[PDB]
Enzyme design. Structure first.
Site, PDB file in Angstrom:
ATOM      1  N   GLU A 113       0.798  -1.235   0.000  1.00 44.92           N
ATOM      2  CA  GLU A 113       0.000   0.000   0.000  1.00 44.92           C
ATOM      3  C   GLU A 113       0.821   1.269   0.000  1.00 44.92           C
ATOM      4  O   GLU A 113       0.569   2.177  -0.762  1.00 44.92           O
ATOM      5  CB  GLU A 113      -0.967   0.039   1.175  1.00 44.92           C
ATOM      6  N   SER A 161     -11.022  11.524  -4.204  1.00 46.40           N
ATOM      7  CA  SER A 161     -10.733  11.216  -2.839  1.00 46.40           C
ATOM      8  C   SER A 161      -9.201  10.942  -2.789  1.00 46.40           C
ATOM      9  O   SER A 161      -8.553  10.884  -3.825  1.00 46.40           O
ATOM     10  CB  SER A 161     -11.485   9.982  -2.386  1.00 46.40           C
ATOM     11  N   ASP A 168     -11.858   9.601  -8.437  1.00 48.39           N
ATOM     12  CA  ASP A 168     -13.044  10.170  -7.852  1.00 48.39           C
ATOM     13  C   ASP A 168     -12.680  11.429  -7.053  1.00 48.39           C
ATOM     14  O   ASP A 168     -13.586  12.047  -6.521  1.00 48.39           O
ATOM     15  CB  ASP A 168     -13.842   9.171  -6.974  1.00 48.39           C
ATOM     16  N   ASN A 190      -8.788   5.611   2.618  1.00 45.73           N
ATOM     17  CA  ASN A 190      -9.535   6.487   1.732  1.00 45.73           C
ATOM     18  C   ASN A 190     -10.333   7.615   2.381  1.00 45.73           C
ATOM     19  O   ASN A 190     -11.012   7.412   3.365  1.00 45.73           O
ATOM     20  CB  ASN A 190     -10.408   5.663   0.817  1.00 45.73           C
ATOM     21  N   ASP A 240      -5.928   8.565  -0.586  1.00 51.83           N
ATOM     22  CA  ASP A 240      -5.518   7.432   0.297  1.00 51.83           C
ATOM     23  C   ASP A 240      -4.392   7.930   1.196  1.00 51.83           C
ATOM     24  O   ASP A 240      -3.543   8.671   0.750  1.00 51.83           O
ATOM     25  CB  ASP A 240      -5.128   6.218  -0.531  1.00 51.83           C
ATOM     26  N   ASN A 245      -7.021   9.765  -5.891  1.00 51.89           N
ATOM     27  CA  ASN A 245      -7.766   8.969  -6.839  1.00 51.89           C
ATOM     28  C   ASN A 245      -8.569   9.814  -7.791  1.00 51.89           C
ATOM     29  O   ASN A 245      -8.751  11.025  -7.628  1.00 51.89           O
ATOM     30  CB  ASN A 245      -8.660   7.902  -6.180  1.00 51.89           C
TER      31      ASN A 245
END
Length: 129
Positions: free
Chosen positions: A35, A50, A48, A59, A52, A46
């Site tokens: 990750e 959003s 969309d 998220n 991480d 991301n």
């Protein structure tokens, strides 16, 4: 902070993650490697819109507040920056809510693609735990 494999395994253990919801320590360590490459400061935005955050790439759409994700739900009740700290405590607490949520560790795309069904015990081998 860029963690060492064993240092992280030990902190995660200390934090109650080994076998949490049936996932052995190695699962958690494997997921962090893939990750964030063990970097607590990792961030990735991301499509969309959003983002991480941290060692477990949590998220901002559901889990934390970053002030720029419309429709954020803030399920862990925390600012997303808290997740970037050298103390893994908030990432850990938040992850425990995520994993309890229905799809288990499948919530983590790298876990699903890179750890899942692999000899994840390898990740804690050699460690003094």
């Amino acid at each position: 902070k860029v963690f060492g494999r064993c240092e992280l395994a030990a902190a995660m253990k200390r934090h109650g993650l080994d076998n949490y919801r049936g996932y052995s320590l190695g699962n958690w360590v494997c997921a962090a490697k893939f990750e964030s490459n063990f970097n607590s400061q990792a961030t990735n935005r991301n499509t969309d819109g959003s983002t991480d955050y941290g060692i477990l790439q949590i998220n901002s759409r559901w889990w934390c507040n970053d002030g720029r994700t419309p429709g954020s739900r803030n399920l862990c009740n925390i600012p997303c920056s808290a997740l970037l700290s050298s103390d893994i405590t908030a990432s850990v607490n938040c992850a425990k809510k995520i994993v309890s949520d229905g799809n288990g560790m499948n919530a983590w795309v790298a876990w699903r693609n890179r750890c899942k069904g692999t000899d994840v015990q390898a990740w804690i081998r050699g460690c003094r735990l």
